[PDB]
Ligand binder design. Structure first.
Ligand SMILES: [Ca+2]
Ligand SMILES: [Ca+2]
Lengths: 54, 223, 54, 223
């Protein structure tokens, strides 16, 4: 599922605050996304992340 | 910037910080009302910060101006990272002074071996994270296209160049995107991407600015 | 890939020290596995994890 | 144990800690030379620790004995968790005293509603982690099979029972596996699994010991 993938920064070099679902903690946590690539466990807000993965 | 050094307050006057509540990308001031950055740094409601050194402390000598419009390059490909360039128009013109200055666009491209100055507030660790308060600088030469192509087989287009060291240890990193690569007083590159940061045989890849000067001029004049 | 999945404890209740490859840190890190279930990013030793994911 | 309380040093004398450099599972002493635990706790080179309270400090009143053989139930299914029971033979017989005692095996099963004592050194947070130094206890009733089946559709076999609270807040957790569920001085369960820990409508699932007494006796006598 998208919610089980680890948070991926990607090869781009920006530091954009995004959210991913952390299976261990069982909730969404923030991470810095590089701006391109990565995977689907990458959401704009904590709320969106929870609506999809919570 | 991994392996760099503290630039010194206001020694890179054309360097800007893109902010949306926190610094997310860098950029370069090309004139009192236009900033050049990377396409993947595109965002709605950007506040441009000029005359900045410590991004965490407002010293009162900075200039915070909102972006009125961000024009991404029409052929930017998020999958290939080709044409990774964006122009940002400031709501109002910056007050150019000893701390805020524009950087010149190139008329000629730079050749391999040229030493350039790269700057930003990105991660300083090639392993783990450590974001600086103050602006970091790094001197790095432009690599030959063959070296670049071999480090990133199938990934380098004619609008990209590699700069840095194949031995690793010195590179730009997350948080540096959109920042300037200035060689001989000219803006020749924009921080874009790379495999990790400061990794051996994985140098930084930058947008080849000399290929976009016309577009930049056409866009500025038409907006 | 197996190396991109988040570390999963599983529904069992033991606390067995295992290893998983952390993409962010780019190396293998330890975690406590419940003893059953979980996913493939679960190795006996750090060395085995590195041989497969490093 | 989430939502439990400190048992008190040596108040649960049949509780053992399974160690392989660190505590990984619990177990119950059924006689001076045999320990009952969960099948998924199976490991090579296990050191059994008896008379234990603070698993992090050796007080000198404990007994550390190596396992000579670990016999997993022949029908243990790692996918279903059915027959999640294992017997461990100690290299030498434990010295039974005020701190080390055996627990009685059942002749009759326990009914729904029976209050049992569950113990272990597992995580004390249903969210996050917090492992205790000393042994924790929890009083919890056995749930009705229908409640159990509805909480875990398709997952409960005739060799499993649910115990705890459907409202959540109190449950066994990671680090408790193999531990005792004692009701009226009899060993009726072994900590096994559950969805998370202390989650509402996700009570703990335990191995129904009364169904294995013959196997236990046959194995002990034949080994
Ligand atoms: Ca400042
Ligand atoms: Ca002790």
């Amino acid at each position: 599922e998208v919610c089980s993938e680890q948070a991926e920064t990607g090869p781009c070099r920006a530091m954009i605050s995004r959210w991913y679902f952390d299976v261990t903690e069982g909730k969404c946590a923030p991470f810095f996304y590089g701006g391109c690539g990565g995977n689907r466990n990458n959401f704009d807000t904590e709320e969106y992340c929870m609506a999809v993965c919570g | 910037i991994v392996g760099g050094y503290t630039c010194g307050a206001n020694t890179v006057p054309y360097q800007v910080s893109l902010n949306s509540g926190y610094h997310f990308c860098g950029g370069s001031l090309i004139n009192s009302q236009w900033v050049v950055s990377a396409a993947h740094c595109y965002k709605s409601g950007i506040q441009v910060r000029l005359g900045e050194d410590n991004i965490n402390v407002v010293e009162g000598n900075e200039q915070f101006i909102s972006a009125s419009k961000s024009i991404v390059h029409p052929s930017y490909n998020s999958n290939t990272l080709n044409n990774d360039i964006m122009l940002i128009k400031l709501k109002s013109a910056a007050s150019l002074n000893s701390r805020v200055a524009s950087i010149s666009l190139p008329t000629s491209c730079a050749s391999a071996g040229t030493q350039c100055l790269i700057s930003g507030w990105g991660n300083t660790k090639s392993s783990g994270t450590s974001y600086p308060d103050v602006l970091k600088c790094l001197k790095a030469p432009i690599l030959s296209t063959s070296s670049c192509k071999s480090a990133y087989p199938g990934q380098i287009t004619s609008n990209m160049f590699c700069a840095g060291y194949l031995e690793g240890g010195k590179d730009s990193c997350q948080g540096d995107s959109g920042g300037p690569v200035v060689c001989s007083g000219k803006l020749q590159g924009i921080v874009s991407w790379g495999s990790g940061c400061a990794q051996k045989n994985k140098p930084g890849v930058y947008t080849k600015v000399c290929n976009y000067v016309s577009w930049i001029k056409q866009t500025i004049a038409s907006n």
